[PDB]
Design a protein around this nucleic acid. Structure first.
Lengths: 116, 44, 150
RNA sequence: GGUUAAGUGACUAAGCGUACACGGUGGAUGCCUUGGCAGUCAGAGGCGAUGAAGGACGUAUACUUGCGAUAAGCCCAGAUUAGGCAGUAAAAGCCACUUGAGUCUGGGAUUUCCGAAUGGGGAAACCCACUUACAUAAGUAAGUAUCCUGUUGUGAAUACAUAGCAACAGGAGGCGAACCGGGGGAACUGAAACAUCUAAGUACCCCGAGGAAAAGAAAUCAACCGAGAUUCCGAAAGUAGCGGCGAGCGAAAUUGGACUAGCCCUUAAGCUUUACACACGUUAGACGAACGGUCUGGAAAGGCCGACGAUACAGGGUGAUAGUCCCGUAGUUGACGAUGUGUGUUCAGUGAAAUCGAGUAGGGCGGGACACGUGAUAUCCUGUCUGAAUAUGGGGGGACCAUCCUCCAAGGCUAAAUACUACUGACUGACCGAUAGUGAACCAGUACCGUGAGGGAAAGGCGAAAAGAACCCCUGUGAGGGGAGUGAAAUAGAACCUGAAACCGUGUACGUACAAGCAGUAGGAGCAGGCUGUCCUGUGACUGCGUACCUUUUGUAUAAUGGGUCAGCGACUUAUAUUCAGUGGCAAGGUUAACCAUCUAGGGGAGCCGUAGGGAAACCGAGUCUUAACUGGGCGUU
RNA sequence: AACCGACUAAUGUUGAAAAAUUAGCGGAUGACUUGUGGCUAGGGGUGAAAGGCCAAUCAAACCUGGAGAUAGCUGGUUCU
RNA sequence: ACUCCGAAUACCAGUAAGUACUAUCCGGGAGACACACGGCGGGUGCUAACGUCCGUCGUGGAGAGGGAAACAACCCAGAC
RNA sequence: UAACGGGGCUAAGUAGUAAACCGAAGCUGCGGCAAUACUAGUAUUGGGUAGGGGAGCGUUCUGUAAGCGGUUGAAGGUGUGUGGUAACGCAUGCUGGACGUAUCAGAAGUGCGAAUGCUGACAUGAGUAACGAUAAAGGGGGUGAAAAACCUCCUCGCCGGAAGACCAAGGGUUCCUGUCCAACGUUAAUCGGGGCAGGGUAAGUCGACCCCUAAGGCGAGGCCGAAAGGCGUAGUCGAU
RNA sequence: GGUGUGAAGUCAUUGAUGCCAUGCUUCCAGGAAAAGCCUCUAAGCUUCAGAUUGUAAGGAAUCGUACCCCAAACCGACACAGGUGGUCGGGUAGAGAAUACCAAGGCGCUUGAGAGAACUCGGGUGAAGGAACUAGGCAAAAUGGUACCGUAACUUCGGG
RNA sequence: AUUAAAAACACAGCACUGUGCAAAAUCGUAAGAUGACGUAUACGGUGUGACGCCUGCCCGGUGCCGGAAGGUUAAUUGAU
RNA sequence: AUUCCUUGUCGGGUAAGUUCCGACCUGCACGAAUGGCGUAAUGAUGGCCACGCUGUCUCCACCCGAGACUCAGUGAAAUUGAAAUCGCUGUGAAGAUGCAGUGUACCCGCGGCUAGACGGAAAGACCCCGUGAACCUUUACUACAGCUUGGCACUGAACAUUGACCCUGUGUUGAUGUUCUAACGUUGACCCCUUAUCGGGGUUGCGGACAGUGCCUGGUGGGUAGUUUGACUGGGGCGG
């Protein structure tokens, strides 16, 4: 039997085109360009799911360093202090505390200083 | 510039006409071929 | 396909993709790369494998209570209406009716009935035994099927 | 509160982006098909000088179809019966209504011109004649080809004669898809080059048939037993062989089938004709079962309810999907006449070569065919040159010889089983469904291209019905549109089913005029819509990261290749054989092929594989081979 | 001069034109030029000879067929 | 292209522990037979070349991630 | 600039000592999936081209199926939601207007972004080049919905061995008239070689036909040739 | 529009490439064929048939005939700056069918309107210089008629 | 034909050579043709290229022409 | 039109001359009908010089027209993976809009220019490769046509000479020569078919077993045809 490809052929093309909504120009209109676009978006999305974890930790460390140095200790010394004090609060939390509860951060800094 | 088609009716008939085709075996082969193909025009 | 002798255009120079025939399978109106020709889809079945299957089927009919052995099954006139009645006595609408030999009357009475075939023991097939909801066999036909299938 | 200063900063969008909405373009998809494709079972297997195939030009109150100046017809006989005068295609003028309306079938009649084309000629569809009749005017009709065969006449060079010439009769000629026999006969290619060889006696050209053709009744095989023409099919068997022993080529004996038939040169069987019978079929056709209500809907064939037919539930149609509405179907019937077939019974032929085979068999030389390439090469055919015997004889049995066996060449005819299908009918499809299927679903071998041979398209779909939009309004008495009306539907309005994408617009939200690159991604403010702000949607300032895809490569962002985009189509198949694996059946067995068949059954055992190996082989054989023989050793045994 | 030709230049080169136009240039009673009709045809013709020409094509025309030649080469080869 | 000498390594074999689905054999299916750079030992070259030819190990090829500004082939390290 | 990646640095260089920290898809943690072993749990394993192996998705068609769903709305189209590791599935609004088809099997014209692929459509260049001889127009009037382009008048210019008038060829109605202006006409068009309808071609003397023949063609018999045919006599055609 | 009616209508000169002329002269390369036509007889027919001359009567069919032809109608895909055989050829000037300007007759070439940049094309002029340009005077510029005068080397005695 | 017009081709003249006519030569399997209704002052091939002065040496090679003695040598024949 | 070295050398011409003219002769590598050397005339022929002439040039300027530009109407094109399409230095499949660092940079047209987009166009013609192709060449290979040789056939008779063999001089064969006619040839003549330069038949002459053709056979045979003509290689060839 002879198979016509139309109906399924369109469904594939449409799937990709729907994933390419919002891209500029051909990249949202034309299957050949959109496909390439939706692939590279997936590639970037894979790479960035990893690199998100790096970017966020850099941000926290930068913020903790700011707060520690306002409380008279370097980031490097503060982490050592906390380690020596057996305080296992993550950088994500520390950095949250540095913004939202400055006093608590200072306590932790004072604890850290004592351990050093 | 002189182009290749310089028609005369007489030369068209004496070369490609029906009585010319019919005169020779191979001409008749052409007429039969064209008649088999279904050609409206067998000769020029 | 008709035509396709002449090379569409010269191999080099035109700027076009090289063609050799307007009836390439790439071209609209061209051949099928692998055009079908008439086939024989027949399969060998070994004689023992056919009989084995047939026995397996009859056995399964018995266990499923689809094989209905009757002493006899005859229709008096070639009348559909009569056969429908007889079937209703057996409380079966959809049934293969295997007799030793098919009477004209029973053959004629069964033609216009759908999902009612009258078959002689010779004419029973692996699919028909499966296809019909019940199989009404005359006891003679049973004994004939036994010899037929070994 | 004001002024000044400093800082800060919304509100611009010429344009552009994204998203959404609504459109346009376009014609995908889906559904559909009045056309194709492949078959099966039948038919018929030819048509043509009694003028074909195919055309030209005409023909009714442009083209297609029909017909031929008797021109969509005339006649006749059957059959049929309410409408008919072909279509586009309306009008118009008419005819008919139970049988001269008309239709269907058959058979007659008519049948321009061209075309084998045939009176001669010729640029096919035109031009011009002769003869004889007629006409009297300057016309009409008929006849008038060539060749072959035969028969009559005439009748040269020389008598005879023959040639020649004329008349008459009977044939033939052309066309056609395949099948068939014969005459000629490539190359690419393969051989990983190429010359023998292959491709291949293929393609192609030519001639000649016929419904088939051809072949055919042993100077055949076999093997000391036997068989009994030919053809076709299954095996033997990819075996024996052949082969730059390469590439490749490839039998028979024998055996299973299908079908069967032999008959004559002391004149046959058959074939053809002819009539007479009879059968026997075909050819127009006829009748042909059974359904209501209700619901949904534009419409009912659908649903619900209850019926009814079925030797009929093939199939098609009808406003959706119908056993019961229609056409059909099953079944039952029908042929005046005309055809075909088969039997006899006849006729007149043919077979036919007469009389059992001599320029023959055989030979030499050169070629060719046989599976066989000249090889140790039998056999066959024969261009050339030769040349027997003649049943006390001769041919063959694969160099050759002997013996033995078998057959009787140099004369013929012969059905069936076999091949094919352009054409007619019926039926079938895990065949296509408009880029497919035919090149061609449609006015297609057309348009178009070409001097020509030749090449060769595109192009289906309103609706159930045209109900195809009266009338009004804008406009050029336009195009186009808006109303009105039609319709179930008018974004079904003829640029007409569905109506994708590319592509182009209008509107709305958000962004965007200090900002540098594969245009995203992870994050993220603000704004706008919802829903009710650790929501959803759209947009996305700002930050990090980030040089398309494919191909080809050691290696490509590569400035290497390919792609303007979209849609559609576009590439590991099929047959056969070998092998391995999985699965199933059966198991030291397994399995049948053609063919038959009441036909997926069952028959059918020919054959194949397994069951033993060793050896070049004879042959031996659980062994064998090697060798004088193995202490052995090779392979095998299990 | 006509006519036949085609030496130079410029233009033109998606042309007005698949070979021209413009300005000049050669022959111009001859081995001239031209019309009509003939004949020669593909390993063939024809050539005052350029492998020139044989229908805008020529170190072997064009068409159809062998034919899907062959292509150790290049490209391309479709869902998870 | 000499050797009175002569290692490290490597290889061959044996014994032995522990770790490891390893080694081997017989079948079905391939693909590949253009390699590149880097280290080490060399030939060639100029102890030139992103040169060329071998040996051997690594990476690339067929391997992402981090480093080396950017950087197949370097350093670190193997992405369900 | 251009021989720190830049800023910039006299330490932010070089060497060293101490103790920190940053840093990967490495390791760990937490959740999940898979392969292979073992005994559902363990243990190991899961980068990958050529390539091998395994398991599936979807498409058309056949059976199942006169079943099942469908005008109370099929397929297709277009949104939305939802499910799975994926191919994809499911549901549903709108559109659409009649088909579709579970399940399990069966068979394939079964999946396209590439082939300077093929067909159609539609972009970009771009409202760009160009609108075909630089012989040349100006004006009044007319008709018309509209006049640079048609008609008309007055002027101007151009050809005049032609850009005039005839004929043959070749073409084939293009001729004339009315009407129309969609397409055609490189603009518009009232005009036209465009569309549509009607009309128009008158022969003893022109030409053809015809008589005659040239080159040459064909060619009864003939001669020659595997066949097809070739040549050629008598003839018969053949104008220029 | 229609009909109606209409003057003069001569002479001279010039003069074809048209006609006499298919002539004449001359040359060599030596100049269709066949029929119609005239004539002669043959076989054959001889009150004939025929022939000639004349006079009446009748015929002469058929097919083409439009239109385009230095082209928008043919050949060039185009309403294409090309190609396409023959005939006719007025005036002034002129040797002329050249050329210029005109006649008869026919056209203004089927996009227009503005503007007055670069640059391109086709032209005009140019101070001073004058081939310095360039591969090369390429291209331009220049010369250009008639009559008379006059004219070198060289030469095959023609030339030049 | 459409990038070469020339020094290239042709040419008159020259020379060699073939050719006795059913000519040579060429087209063609053949018939038949051309040559030629010609006949060596003709015809064909080859080269040279108006005209003037001239055109040397070499016959080993390879052609061609002639010579035949001998040697070698096919079909054929068929002695042994 | 030949000369490498080479712009030879000398002379002329010019301020200056690889060209030109004259001449020399160590002619790489002229040379006598592939003619040698001259040669009037001729040439859209090659080289060189001079006068005249000039926008050729110094070195352009101005002007007249047709485009270009603007308005109105019509409306192409090649090209195009997608583009949010900067410079520099560096990097990098080794010459960067796109990478790194950095510098610069508001958004968008229009007229111009062509440096880059290794811009467009044409699957590089160069070069190599393919056990590709074609056509051409020859003392490449193998064939074939044609030509030619002999044998046999169509094809015969007499003699004469002679060879072999045979017997007892004799025959049987073979050559060779002459003669002959009867096959065969005749593209001589005449007759007839027959109105015929074909053909056939008849007659006759001239030839005559020759020629010619078939089969076989040796030779010749680029006239023609099919083909072959290695690989490695610091491209390939040459060499090896």
């Amino acid at each position: 039997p002879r198979v016509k490809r139309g109906v399924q052929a369109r469904a594939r093309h449409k799937k990709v085109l729907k994933q390419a909504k919002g891209y500029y120009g051909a990249r949202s209109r034309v299957y050949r360009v959109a496909f390439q676009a939706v692939t590279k978006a997936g590639q970037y999305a894979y790479r960035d799911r990893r690199a998100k974890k790096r970017q966020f930790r850099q941000l926290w460390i930068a913020r903790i360093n700011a707060a520690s140095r306002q409380n008279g200790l370097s980031y490097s010394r503060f982490i050592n202090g906390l380690k020596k004090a057996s305080i296992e609060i993550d950088r994500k939390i520390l950095a949250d505390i540095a913004v939202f509860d400055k006093a608590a951060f200072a306590v932790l800094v004072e604890k850290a200083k004592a351990a050093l | 510039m002189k182009r290749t088609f310089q028609p005369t009716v007489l030369k068209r008939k004496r070369t490609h006409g029906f009585r010319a085709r019919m005169a020779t075996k191979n001409g008749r082969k052409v007429i039969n071929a064209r008649r088999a193909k279904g050609r409206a025009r067998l000769s020029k | 396909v008709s035509g396709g002798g002449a090379k569409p255009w010269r191999q080099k120079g035109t700027g076009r993709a090289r063609a050799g025939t307007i009836r390439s399978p790439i071209w609209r109106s061209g051949g099928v790369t692998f055009a079908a020709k008439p086939q024989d889809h027949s399969q060998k079945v070994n004689k023992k494998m056919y009989r084995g299957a047939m026995k397996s089927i009859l056995s399964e009919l018995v266990r499923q209570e689809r094989l209905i052995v009757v002493d006899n099954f005859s229709v008096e006139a070639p009348k559909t209406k009569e056969l429908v009645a007889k079937l209703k006595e057996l409380e079966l609408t959809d049934a293969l009716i295997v007799t030793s030999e098919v009477d004209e009357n029973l053959f004629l009475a069964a033609r216009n009935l759908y999902k009612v075939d009258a078959r002689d023991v010779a004419g029973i097939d692996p699919v028909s035994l499966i296809a019909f909801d019940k199989v009404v066999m005359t006891a003679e036909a049973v004994k004939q099927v036994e010899e037929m299938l070994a």
